[PDB]
Coordinates of C-alpha atoms and ligand atoms in Angstrom, one line a residue:
Chain A
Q1 CA -7.9 -30.9 -8.3
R2 CA -4.5 -30.1 -9.9
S3 CA -1.4 -32.0 -9.3
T4 CA 0.5 -30.7 -6.2
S5 CA 4.0 -29.3 -6.5
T6 CA 6.2 -27.7 -3.9
Chain B
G1 CA 19.9 -2.8 -11.7
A2 CA 17.4 -0.6 -9.7
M3 CA 18.7 -2.5 -6.7
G4 CA 22.4 -1.8 -7.3
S5 CA 22.7 0.9 -4.8
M6 CA 21.1 -1.0 -1.9
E7 CA 23.1 -3.0 0.5
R8 CA 22.8 -6.8 0.3
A9 CA 21.7 -7.1 3.9
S10 CA 19.0 -4.4 3.3
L11 CA 17.6 -6.2 0.3
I12 CA 17.3 -9.3 2.3
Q13 CA 15.7 -7.5 5.2
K14 CA 13.2 -5.9 2.8
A15 CA 12.5 -9.2 1.1
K16 CA 11.4 -10.5 4.5
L17 CA 9.2 -7.4 5.1
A18 CA 7.7 -7.8 1.6
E19 CA 6.9 -11.4 2.4
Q20 CA 5.1 -10.4 5.6
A21 CA 3.1 -7.8 3.6
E22 CA 2.4 -10.3 0.9
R23 CA 4.1 -8.1 -1.6
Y24 CA 5.7 -10.9 -3.7
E25 CA 6.7 -8.9 -6.7
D26 CA 8.6 -6.6 -4.4
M27 CA 10.0 -9.6 -2.6
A28 CA 11.2 -11.0 -5.9
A29 CA 12.8 -7.8 -7.0
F30 CA 14.7 -7.5 -3.7
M31 CA 15.9 -11.1 -3.9
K32 CA 17.0 -10.6 -7.5
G33 CA 19.0 -7.6 -6.3
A34 CA 20.5 -9.7 -3.6
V35 CA 21.5 -12.4 -6.1
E36 CA 23.1 -9.8 -8.4
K37 CA 25.5 -8.8 -5.6
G38 CA 27.4 -11.9 -6.7
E39 CA 27.7 -13.7 -3.4
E40 CA 26.4 -17.1 -2.8
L41 CA 23.1 -17.5 -1.0
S42 CA 22.6 -19.0 2.4
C43 CA 19.8 -21.6 2.9
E44 CA 17.5 -19.0 4.3
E45 CA 18.2 -16.7 1.4
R46 CA 17.7 -19.4 -1.2
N47 CA 14.3 -20.1 0.3
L48 CA 13.4 -16.4 0.1
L49 CA 14.3 -16.3 -3.5
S50 CA 12.2 -19.4 -4.2
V51 CA 9.2 -18.2 -2.3
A52 CA 9.1 -14.9 -4.0
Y53 CA 9.2 -16.2 -7.5
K54 CA 7.0 -19.1 -6.8
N55 CA 4.3 -16.7 -5.7
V56 CA 4.8 -14.3 -8.6
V57 CA 4.8 -17.1 -11.3
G58 CA 2.0 -18.9 -9.5
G59 CA -0.3 -16.0 -9.9
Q60 CA 0.6 -15.6 -13.5
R61 CA 0.1 -19.3 -14.2
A62 CA -3.4 -19.2 -12.6
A63 CA -4.3 -16.2 -14.7
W64 CA -3.0 -17.9 -17.8
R65 CA -5.1 -20.9 -17.1
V66 CA -8.3 -18.9 -16.7
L67 CA -7.6 -17.0 -20.0
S68 CA -6.6 -20.2 -21.9
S69 CA -9.8 -21.8 -20.8
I70 CA -11.9 -18.8 -22.1
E71 CA -9.9 -18.9 -25.4
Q72 CA -10.5 -22.6 -25.8
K73 CA -14.2 -22.2 -25.3
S74 CA -14.2 -19.4 -28.0
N75 CA -12.8 -21.8 -30.4
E76 CA -15.7 -24.3 -30.1
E77 CA -18.4 -24.9 -32.7
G78 CA -21.4 -22.4 -32.1
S79 CA -19.3 -19.9 -30.2
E80 CA -19.9 -16.3 -31.3
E81 CA -16.8 -14.5 -32.8
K82 CA -15.6 -11.9 -30.3
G83 CA -12.4 -10.7 -32.1
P84 CA -8.8 -10.9 -31.1
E85 CA -9.0 -9.6 -27.6
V86 CA -9.0 -13.0 -25.7
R87 CA -6.0 -14.2 -27.6
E88 CA -4.2 -10.9 -27.2
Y89 CA -4.7 -10.8 -23.5
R90 CA -3.8 -14.4 -23.0
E91 CA -0.6 -13.6 -25.0
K92 CA 0.1 -10.6 -22.8
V93 CA -0.1 -12.7 -19.6
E94 CA 1.9 -15.5 -21.3
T95 CA 4.7 -13.1 -22.3
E96 CA 4.9 -11.7 -18.8
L97 CA 5.0 -15.2 -17.4
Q98 CA 7.7 -16.2 -19.8
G99 CA 9.7 -13.1 -18.8
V100 CA 9.6 -14.1 -15.1
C101 CA 10.8 -17.6 -16.0
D102 CA 13.5 -16.2 -18.1
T103 CA 14.6 -13.9 -15.3
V104 CA 14.8 -16.8 -12.8
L105 CA 16.6 -19.0 -15.3
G106 CA 19.0 -16.1 -16.0
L107 CA 19.9 -15.8 -12.3
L108 CA 20.5 -19.6 -12.1
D109 CA 22.8 -19.4 -15.2
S110 CA 24.5 -16.2 -14.1
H111 CA 25.9 -17.5 -11.8
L112 CA 24.1 -19.3 -9.0
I113 CA 24.4 -22.9 -10.3
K114 CA 28.1 -22.7 -11.3
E115 CA 29.1 -21.5 -7.8
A116 CA 26.9 -24.1 -6.0
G117 CA 29.1 -27.0 -4.8
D118 CA 27.2 -28.3 -1.7
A119 CA 24.4 -30.8 -2.5
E120 CA 21.8 -28.6 -0.6
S121 CA 22.5 -25.6 -2.8
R122 CA 23.1 -27.4 -6.1
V123 CA 20.0 -29.7 -5.9
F124 CA 17.9 -26.7 -4.8
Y125 CA 19.0 -24.6 -7.9
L126 CA 18.7 -27.5 -10.3
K127 CA 15.2 -28.2 -9.0
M128 CA 14.4 -24.5 -9.6
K129 CA 15.8 -24.8 -13.1
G130 CA 13.6 -27.7 -13.8
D131 CA 10.5 -26.0 -12.3
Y132 CA 10.9 -22.8 -14.4
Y133 CA 11.5 -24.8 -17.6
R134 CA 8.4 -26.8 -16.7
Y135 CA 6.4 -23.5 -16.4
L136 CA 7.7 -22.5 -19.8
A137 CA 6.6 -25.9 -21.1
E138 CA 3.1 -25.5 -19.8
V139 CA 2.6 -22.6 -22.3
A140 CA 4.7 -23.8 -25.1
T141 CA 3.0 -24.6 -28.3
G142 CA 5.8 -24.0 -31.0
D143 CA 8.8 -25.6 -32.5
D144 CA 10.9 -25.3 -29.4
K145 CA 8.4 -27.2 -27.1
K146 CA 10.4 -30.4 -27.2
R147 CA 13.6 -28.7 -26.4
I148 CA 11.9 -26.8 -23.5
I149 CA 10.6 -30.1 -22.2
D150 CA 14.0 -31.7 -22.5
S151 CA 15.6 -28.8 -20.6
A152 CA 13.3 -29.3 -17.7
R153 CA 13.9 -33.1 -17.8
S154 CA 17.7 -32.6 -17.9
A155 CA 17.8 -30.2 -14.9
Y156 CA 15.5 -32.4 -12.9
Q157 CA 17.6 -35.5 -13.7
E158 CA 20.8 -33.9 -12.7
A159 CA 19.2 -32.8 -9.5
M160 CA 17.9 -36.4 -8.9
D161 CA 21.3 -37.9 -9.5
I162 CA 23.0 -35.7 -7.0
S163 CA 20.3 -36.0 -4.4
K164 CA 20.3 -39.8 -4.5
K165 CA 24.1 -39.8 -3.9
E166 CA 24.4 -37.1 -1.4
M167 CA 21.1 -36.8 0.6
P168 CA 19.1 -39.1 2.8
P169 CA 15.7 -40.2 1.4
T170 CA 13.9 -38.0 3.9
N171 CA 15.7 -34.8 3.0
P172 CA 13.0 -32.2 2.2
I173 CA 14.8 -30.8 -0.8
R174 CA 15.2 -34.4 -2.2
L175 CA 11.5 -35.1 -1.5
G176 CA 10.3 -31.9 -3.1
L177 CA 12.4 -32.5 -6.1
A178 CA 11.0 -35.9 -6.6
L179 CA 7.5 -34.5 -6.1
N180 CA 8.0 -31.9 -8.8
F181 CA 9.8 -34.3 -11.2
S182 CA 6.8 -36.7 -10.8
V183 CA 4.5 -33.8 -11.7
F184 CA 6.6 -33.1 -14.7
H185 CA 6.2 -36.7 -15.8
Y186 CA 2.5 -36.7 -15.3
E187 CA 1.6 -33.2 -16.6
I188 CA 4.3 -32.4 -19.2
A189 CA 5.9 -35.6 -20.4
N190 CA 2.8 -37.7 -20.9
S191 CA 4.3 -40.3 -18.6
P192 CA 1.8 -41.0 -15.9
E193 CA 3.3 -44.4 -15.1
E194 CA 6.7 -42.9 -14.5
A195 CA 5.1 -40.3 -12.4
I196 CA 3.3 -42.9 -10.2
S197 CA 6.4 -45.1 -9.9
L198 CA 8.6 -42.1 -8.9
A199 CA 6.1 -40.9 -6.3
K200 CA 5.6 -44.5 -4.9
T201 CA 9.3 -45.2 -4.6
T202 CA 10.1 -41.8 -3.1
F203 CA 7.4 -42.2 -0.5
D204 CA 8.4 -45.7 0.4
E205 CA 12.1 -44.9 0.7
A206 CA 11.4 -41.9 2.9
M207 CA 9.1 -43.9 5.1
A208 CA 11.9 -46.4 5.8
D209 CA 14.2 -43.6 6.9
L210 CA 11.9 -41.7 9.2
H211 CA 13.2 -43.6 12.2
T212 CA 16.5 -41.8 12.0
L213 CA 14.9 -38.3 12.5
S214 CA 14.3 -35.9 15.2
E215 CA 10.7 -34.9 15.9
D216 CA 11.2 -31.6 14.0
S217 CA 12.8 -33.3 11.0
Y218 CA 10.0 -35.9 11.0
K219 CA 7.5 -33.1 10.7
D220 CA 9.3 -31.5 7.8
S221 CA 9.6 -34.8 5.9
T222 CA 6.2 -36.1 6.5
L223 CA 4.6 -32.9 5.3
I224 CA 6.1 -33.4 1.8
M225 CA 5.4 -37.2 1.9
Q226 CA 1.8 -36.3 2.3
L227 CA 2.0 -34.3 -1.0
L228 CA 3.3 -37.4 -2.7
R229 CA 0.4 -39.3 -1.3
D230 CA -2.0 -36.6 -2.5
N231 CA -0.8 -37.0 -6.0
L232 CA -0.9 -40.8 -5.9
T233 CA -4.5 -40.6 -4.7
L234 CA -5.3 -38.2 -7.5
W235 CA -3.5 -40.3 -10.2
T236 CA -4.7 -43.7 -9.2
Chain C
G1 CA -1.2 6.6 -22.8
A2 CA -0.1 2.9 -23.4
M3 CA -3.8 2.3 -24.0
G4 CA -4.2 5.0 -26.5
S5 CA -4.1 2.7 -29.5
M6 CA -6.6 0.2 -28.2
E7 CA -10.3 0.5 -29.0
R8 CA -12.6 1.5 -26.2
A9 CA -14.7 -1.6 -26.5
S10 CA -11.5 -3.8 -26.5
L11 CA -10.3 -2.1 -23.3
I12 CA -13.6 -2.9 -21.6
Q13 CA -13.7 -6.5 -22.9
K14 CA -10.1 -6.9 -21.5
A15 CA -11.0 -5.4 -18.2
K16 CA -13.7 -8.0 -17.8
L17 CA -11.2 -10.8 -18.7
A18 CA -8.7 -9.3 -16.3
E19 CA -11.3 -9.4 -13.5
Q20 CA -12.0 -13.1 -14.3
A21 CA -8.3 -13.7 -14.1
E22 CA -8.0 -11.7 -10.9
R23 CA -5.5 -9.4 -12.6
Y24 CA -6.6 -6.2 -11.0
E25 CA -3.7 -4.0 -11.9
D26 CA -4.3 -4.9 -15.5
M27 CA -8.0 -4.3 -15.0
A28 CA -7.3 -0.9 -13.6
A29 CA -5.0 0.0 -16.5
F30 CA -7.6 -1.1 -19.1
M31 CA -10.3 1.0 -17.3
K32 CA -8.0 4.0 -17.1
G33 CA -7.5 3.7 -20.8
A34 CA -11.2 3.4 -21.4
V35 CA -11.9 6.6 -19.3
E36 CA -9.2 8.5 -21.2
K37 CA -11.2 7.9 -24.4
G38 CA -13.2 10.8 -23.2
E39 CA -16.7 9.3 -23.3
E40 CA -18.9 9.0 -20.4
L41 CA -19.1 5.6 -18.7
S42 CA -22.1 3.4 -18.4
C43 CA -23.3 1.9 -15.1
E44 CA -21.5 -1.3 -15.9
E45 CA -18.3 0.5 -16.9
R46 CA -18.3 2.7 -13.7
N47 CA -18.5 -0.5 -11.7
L48 CA -15.6 -2.0 -13.6
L49 CA -13.5 1.1 -12.9
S50 CA -14.4 0.9 -9.2
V51 CA -13.8 -2.7 -8.7
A52 CA -10.4 -2.5 -10.4
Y53 CA -9.0 0.3 -8.3
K54 CA -10.6 -0.9 -5.1
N55 CA -8.8 -4.1 -5.4
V56 CA -5.5 -2.5 -6.3
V57 CA -5.6 0.1 -3.5
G58 CA -7.0 -2.4 -1.1
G59 CA -4.0 -4.6 -1.4
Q60 CA -1.7 -1.6 -1.0
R61 CA -3.6 -0.5 2.1
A62 CA -3.3 -3.9 3.6
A63 CA 0.5 -4.0 3.0
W64 CA 0.8 -0.5 4.4
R65 CA -0.9 -1.5 7.5
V66 CA 1.4 -4.5 8.0
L67 CA 4.5 -2.4 7.5
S68 CA 3.2 0.5 9.7
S69 CA 2.6 -2.0 12.5
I70 CA 6.2 -3.3 12.2
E71 CA 7.5 0.3 12.2
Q72 CA 5.5 1.2 15.3
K73 CA 6.8 -1.8 17.1
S74 CA 10.4 -0.8 16.2
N75 CA 9.8 2.5 17.9
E76 CA 8.9 1.1 21.3
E77 CA 11.2 1.1 24.3
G78 CA 13.6 -1.9 24.3
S79 CA 13.3 -2.6 20.6
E80 CA 16.6 -3.2 18.9
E81 CA 17.7 -0.6 16.2
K82 CA 17.4 -2.2 12.8
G83 CA 18.3 0.8 10.6
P84 CA 16.2 2.7 8.1
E85 CA 14.8 -0.3 6.1
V86 CA 11.4 -0.6 7.7
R87 CA 10.7 3.1 7.3
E88 CA 12.1 3.1 3.7
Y89 CA 9.9 0.2 2.7
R90 CA 6.8 1.6 4.3
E91 CA 7.5 4.8 2.5
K92 CA 7.9 3.0 -0.8
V93 CA 4.5 1.2 -0.4
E94 CA 3.0 4.5 0.8
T95 CA 4.2 6.4 -2.2
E96 CA 2.8 3.8 -4.6
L97 CA -0.6 3.9 -2.7
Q98 CA -0.6 7.7 -2.9
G99 CA 0.1 7.4 -6.6
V100 CA -2.9 5.1 -7.2
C101 CA -5.1 7.5 -5.3
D102 CA -3.8 10.4 -7.3
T103 CA -4.5 8.5 -10.5
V104 CA -8.1 7.9 -9.5
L105 CA -8.6 11.4 -8.3
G106 CA -7.1 12.6 -11.6
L107 CA -9.6 10.6 -13.7
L108 CA -12.5 12.0 -11.6
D109 CA -11.2 15.6 -12.1
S110 CA -10.3 15.1 -15.7
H111 CA -13.2 14.8 -16.6
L112 CA -15.6 12.3 -15.1
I113 CA -17.3 14.3 -12.5
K114 CA -17.9 17.5 -14.6
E115 CA -19.6 15.4 -17.3
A116 CA -21.8 13.5 -14.8
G117 CA -25.3 14.9 -14.6
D118 CA -27.5 12.0 -13.6
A119 CA -27.6 11.3 -9.9
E120 CA -26.5 7.6 -10.4
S121 CA -23.2 8.7 -12.0
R122 CA -22.6 11.9 -10.1
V123 CA -23.1 10.3 -6.7
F124 CA -21.0 7.3 -7.7
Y125 CA -18.1 9.5 -8.7
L126 CA -18.3 11.8 -5.7
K127 CA -18.4 8.7 -3.4
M128 CA -15.2 7.6 -5.2
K129 CA -13.6 11.0 -4.7
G130 CA -14.4 10.8 -1.0
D131 CA -13.1 7.2 -0.7
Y132 CA -9.7 8.0 -2.4
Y133 CA -9.2 11.1 -0.3
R134 CA -10.0 8.9 2.7
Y135 CA -7.3 6.5 1.7
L136 CA -4.9 9.4 1.4
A137 CA -6.0 10.5 4.9
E138 CA -5.2 7.1 6.3
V139 CA -1.5 7.6 5.6
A140 CA -1.3 11.3 6.1
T141 CA 0.8 12.7 8.8
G142 CA 1.9 16.1 7.6
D143 CA 0.7 19.7 7.3
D144 CA -1.8 18.9 4.7
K145 CA -3.6 16.2 6.7
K146 CA -6.4 18.5 7.7
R147 CA -7.0 19.6 4.1
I148 CA -7.0 16.0 2.9
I149 CA -9.6 15.1 5.5
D150 CA -11.7 18.1 4.5
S151 CA -11.5 17.1 0.9
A152 CA -12.9 13.7 1.7
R153 CA -15.6 15.2 3.9
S154 CA -16.6 17.7 1.2
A155 CA -16.9 15.1 -1.6
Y156 CA -18.9 12.8 0.6
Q157 CA -21.2 15.6 1.7
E158 CA -21.9 16.7 -1.9
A159 CA -22.7 13.1 -2.7
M160 CA -25.0 12.8 0.3
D161 CA -26.8 16.0 -0.5
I162 CA -27.5 14.7 -4.1
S163 CA -28.4 11.2 -3.0
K164 CA -30.9 12.4 -0.4
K165 CA -32.7 14.6 -3.0
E166 CA -32.5 12.3 -6.0
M167 CA -32.5 8.6 -4.8
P168 CA -34.7 6.4 -2.7
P169 CA -33.3 5.4 0.7
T170 CA -32.8 1.9 -0.5
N171 CA -30.7 2.8 -3.6
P172 CA -27.5 0.7 -3.3
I173 CA -25.3 3.6 -4.3
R174 CA -26.9 5.8 -1.6
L175 CA -26.5 3.1 0.9
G176 CA -22.9 2.4 0.1
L177 CA -22.1 6.1 0.2
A178 CA -23.6 6.4 3.7
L179 CA -21.7 3.3 4.8
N180 CA -18.4 4.7 3.7
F181 CA -19.1 8.2 5.0
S182 CA -19.9 6.6 8.4
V183 CA -16.6 4.8 8.2
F184 CA -14.9 8.2 7.4
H185 CA -16.6 9.7 10.6
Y186 CA -15.5 6.8 12.8
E187 CA -12.0 6.1 11.4
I188 CA -10.8 9.4 10.1
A189 CA -12.7 12.3 11.6
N190 CA -12.7 11.1 15.2
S191 CA -16.5 11.4 15.2
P192 CA -17.8 8.0 16.4
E193 CA -21.2 9.5 17.4
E194 CA -21.7 10.9 14.0
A195 CA -20.7 7.6 12.4
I196 CA -23.2 5.7 14.6
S197 CA -26.0 8.2 14.0
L198 CA -25.5 8.1 10.2
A199 CA -25.4 4.3 10.1
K200 CA -28.6 4.0 12.3
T201 CA -30.6 6.6 10.4
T202 CA -29.5 5.1 7.0
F203 CA -30.5 1.6 8.1
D204 CA -33.8 2.7 9.5
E205 CA -34.9 4.8 6.4
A206 CA -33.9 1.9 4.1
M207 CA -35.9 -0.6 6.2
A208 CA -39.0 1.5 5.8
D209 CA -38.7 1.6 2.0
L210 CA -38.0 -2.1 1.4
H211 CA -41.7 -2.7 0.8
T212 CA -41.5 -0.8 -2.5
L213 CA -38.9 -3.2 -4.0
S214 CA -38.8 -6.2 -6.2
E215 CA -37.2 -9.3 -4.9
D216 CA -34.0 -8.7 -6.7
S217 CA -33.8 -5.0 -5.5
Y218 CA -34.6 -6.2 -2.0
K219 CA -31.6 -8.5 -2.1
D220 CA -29.3 -5.7 -3.4
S221 CA -30.4 -3.3 -0.7
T222 CA -30.4 -5.7 2.2
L223 CA -26.9 -6.8 1.5
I224 CA -25.6 -3.3 2.1
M225 CA -27.9 -2.8 5.1
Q226 CA -26.2 -5.7 6.7
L227 CA -22.9 -4.0 6.3
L228 CA -24.3 -1.0 8.2
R229 CA -25.5 -3.4 10.9
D230 CA -22.0 -5.0 11.0
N231 CA -20.4 -1.7 11.7
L232 CA -23.1 -0.7 14.3
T233 CA -22.4 -4.0 16.1
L234 CA -18.7 -3.3 16.0
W235 CA -19.0 0.3 17.2
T236 CA -21.5 -0.2 20.0
Chain D
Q1 CA -12.3 -6.6 13.0
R2 CA -12.0 -3.5 10.8
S3 CA -14.8 -1.2 9.9
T4 CA -16.6 -2.4 6.7
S5 CA -16.7 -0.2 3.6
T6 CA -18.1 -1.0 0.2
Ligands
CL1 CL1 -3.7 -7.1 -24.2
CL2 CL1 12.5 0.3 -0.2
MG3 MG1 27.9 -3.6 0.7
MG4 MG1 -24.8 -17.1 -32.4
MG5 MG1 3.1 -16.7 -27.0
MG6 MG1 -12.6 3.8 -31.7
MG7 MG1 18.6 -5.5 23.0
MG8 MG1 5.4 9.6 2.9

């Protein structure tokens, strides 16, 4: 799981 | 450029068609053309610009990561020598990725940011600036790495300062900025505690302001709050 | 071309990396470069060529279909006039798609097909020729449409004739050829009965030959047989 | 559902 960005 | 002879409105119409078609490089090229008309962008137009380039660079980043992983494995003890090709191809993808980031940063510098006076626009563009420096930082390995990292930090920090003064804690642009700056801290700046603290504080301050919102704004805000929660769960 | 200075083996290595990275336009460009070295292609190399271009053109076809649908809706009674942009953009995508098909057909004509003497290679390339004429036919609306359709038919028919003489009914290339020629009949040639009959006959003759196969060949063949069944279920 | 090719 990667860090989530937007 | 190639888009110079096309009407602004036509470029934006075609960007929307390109998005429907999942033709994101075309979408990006149309939006670049629209920016280069020299007029400020509306909210909708800013979002088209963002979506286009996010999709383009996102695919490049994903490819880069696959190739970097293969390259790292090639450099392990007991791995057979395979020649320069993995490095060369990773370099090719990297250079293209850097070129897209440089394109976006160039549009921001010439002249989107200097013309943006409302908090909605200014924060949005400074967040973009931080994001594309962050993507440059993901692939940086040389003497400029610290300056690239500092450029991302500086852009995000300016955006944060404005957003805290000028936007409610639930504003989706503010929330997405905080999300991405937290990712910067965790992934780029080797500052997981700062990342966690920012995400926590952001989440909690947003929670406390939800009561002020319409149903539709509630939806918008809570969607991004959940992304903060997802990272917190990952990181803790 | 741009690939002229790169070793054959390096182009093929990079095609494989590009595939892993899901960089199909790069994969296609590397394989084009490899073909243009002038040597015949191995089985593995033929499959790299096919996969690369199938992915590129498949994305173009999907985009074309989205844009064509929007264009058709624009031409209905009570639809507001929106100007030339939908047509122009559909035309842009169409022209790019035609260019990829022309590229592939050009590699087949110069000189892959004329050098291919074994049934495996010859059938594979003639199937490709039929497929890319079929893609041209999907977007054809002018005076040459019938000739484009006939070119696809002719290539497929030559491939079928060879495959029936030279390959067992379970051979995956033979099966995939029959699958695609059946799609041609149904989707392009307005011949749904021919499509259904070919798919039925192909399926049944393959079924009867499965007993001759190893476990791994069984798997290979049955996977394509299921695609024939999927179309039969759709079409009947 | 579109026709399947390979
Ligand atoms: Cl390369
Ligand atoms: Cl266009
Ligand atoms: Mg004008
Ligand atoms: Mg060894
Ligand atoms: Mg580099
Ligand atoms: Mg050589
Ligand atoms: Mg009306
Ligand atoms: Mg045309």
